[PDB]
Design a protein around this ligand. Sequence first.
Ligand SMILES: [Ca+2]
Length: 223
Amino acid sequence: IVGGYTCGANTVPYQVSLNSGYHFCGGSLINSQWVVSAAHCYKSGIQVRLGEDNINVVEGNEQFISASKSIVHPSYNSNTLNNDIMLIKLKSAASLNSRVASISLPTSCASAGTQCLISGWGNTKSSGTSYPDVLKCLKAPILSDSSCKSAYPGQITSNMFCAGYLEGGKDSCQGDSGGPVVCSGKLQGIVSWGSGCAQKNKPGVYTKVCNYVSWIKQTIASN
Ligand SMILES: [Ca+2]
């Protein structure tokens, strides 16, 4: 997250870190046994880390649970990033309370102008590299589809939305991928892609979760 603020320990209780010997992607806890992330985050050998603030220090609220199964969206296209969404099932159910909690799926899509919270442990610089140890937060509005398509001609599908600032300076970044965009207490987006980070006229592009609710529910119910 570029241009954000330190969230505070366990203020974002549905945030997860995906770990394969090091943090590589974020994700969101949607119930006690399932996580949603970006398909471009796919790896074998994932451990899901819940209850994290500082990802380099054991602080006392963490739950570390291995993945038993990963399911990439059946129509994921790695060249266009269309359908950049994946589900991860945990080997055992997480223990839920105020500091580890699930986030609700949306019943409708959010409109341009809605303010949302984006969070993660990704790069905090638009030029160069600096990865934080503690979780960073950013408040950002959803942009209109027209703005979003004008910023990225020929690249925005119906499964994507833009959020952020056309002026630049504030954005998600590498390492935030897979993490949550929450608006009005519902999961509306997954950190997916962008051209660089926090560049003028190049806002973040997010997977539009409201288009996937039936797939997520059906998948959860049978696996
Ligand atoms: Ca920790």
